[PDB]
Design a binder for this molecule. Structure first.
Ligand code: F
Lengths: 249, 243
């Protein structure tokens, strides 16, 4: 059975004081023991969070670059994350693909290097509104996944979690139903079965990275191919605890 | 103008290597007349700020445009303020040319960092292709004009301009002095004579122990933005160039 996986992406949010309050709430919370939980603070707070946070929750960077070291002002490497005991990195987030123009190949290079440097990867994919209305949801996610598949080995996939972002329902005012999210997750899993292997399709957690809150997380978690969440704003809030507990009665 | 030496570590550092670099700096004898700033990777900013001698200030290598928001992978100037990091490098050639930061984006970051109380090492400079097309003066003018349109005359007192001869990346002192003079003339004709007289213009080409004193001697070179040598004990020799 695929272990349920709940990631919290703080994005560009946090102070020493607000992070201390957020971490205290998580440290005091009663958490579903079969859920794998990962928190992604801004890079400058990664040591602070890793030192204060309960050890059953792991820490993620929100991005890294493609080499171990070099002349790349403003970039961090997977070796640095490993050095600091940061076992996870988010790569290919739609904000980085769109705002910062990260190419499919760049996301694939970053993924391969992070895997080879010992990290696990939350790999983000998803189609825009124009792509969805033009009928290209599956062409887009197949293309975004093929770029990684072409660079990483079959065994490399064991340390990958795929986050589906319905970019078409982020900032557009549209709302994705659990039914619509389930349909894409099932299409992602079949892409894995037919283009990577039976094992990778059965083992890879595909988590939903659309709008997730206390009000909708239980209905979303019940969908057969939704293995958890990549949560945005709600990961800054106490209801993140409820989202972690989405599979509990 | 007070001599200014910046050390840009770029994507380099580990806990153990930074511990040796910082202890070397803490043991060094530094020219008291020199303002020294060092810029580690973002994940090491707390570690460095805690361990480093307080007379060397710490800089981030980049930041974004707003206090907070939905910008996965980005750091805010408010976070730097929160962590006691008083400086930031903006517009480094690697950010402009590899990661595609536009002159307008660098300006937005500069105005936001200054409004947030930080000082800014503002990097400018032209590529080989630009210099071959005779665009040296045009490029530094457009890069500077983007910032000058957005910030006030007084905002310039917390800006240090770093000129990078990107064209030489892959480099004589006379060639450096020539551009520094043009940059200062641009400030005088587009900002004020006082900003021009007051603003440090530091040289951000390949700096090491051999060229420090010759470059420091040039009338319009006010210090250095040091790359690879900033990881080495020789960084101390560079800080003491006017001695
Ligand atoms: F530099």
């Amino acid at each position: 059975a695929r272990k349920f996986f709940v990631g919290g992406n703080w994005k560009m949010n946090g102070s020493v004081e607000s992070i201390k309050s957020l971490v205290e709430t998580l440290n005091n919370a009663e958490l579903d023991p079969n859920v794998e939980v990962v928190i992604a603070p801004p890079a400058v707070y990664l040591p602070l969070v890793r030192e204060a946070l309960r050890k059953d929750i792991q820490v993620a960077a929100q991005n890294c670059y493609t080499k171990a070291s070099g002349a790349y002002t403003g970039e961090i490497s997977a070796e640095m994350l490993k050095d600091l005991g940061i076992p996870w990195v988010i790569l290919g987030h739609s904000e980085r693909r769109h705002i910062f123009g990260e190419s499919d190949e760049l996301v694939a290079e970053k993924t391969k290097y992070a895997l080879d440097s010992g990290l696990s990867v939350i790999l983000c994919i998803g189609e825009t509104l124009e792509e969805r209305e033009a009928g290209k949801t599956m062409d887009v996610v197949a293309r975004q996944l093929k770029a990684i598949a072409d660079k990483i080995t079959e065994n490399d996939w064991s340390k990958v979690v795929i986050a589906y972002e319905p970019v078409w329902a982020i900032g557009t005012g549209k709302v994705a139903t659990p039914e619509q999210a389930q349909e894409v997750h099932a299409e992602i899993r079949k892409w894995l079965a037919e283009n990577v292997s039976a094992e990778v399709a059965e083992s890879t957690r595909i988590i939903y990275g659309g709008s997730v809150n206390g009000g909708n997380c239980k209905e979303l978690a019940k969908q057969p191919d939704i293995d958890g969440f990549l949560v945005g704003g709600a990961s800054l809030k106490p209801e993140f605890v409820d989202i972690i507990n989405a599979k509990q009665a």
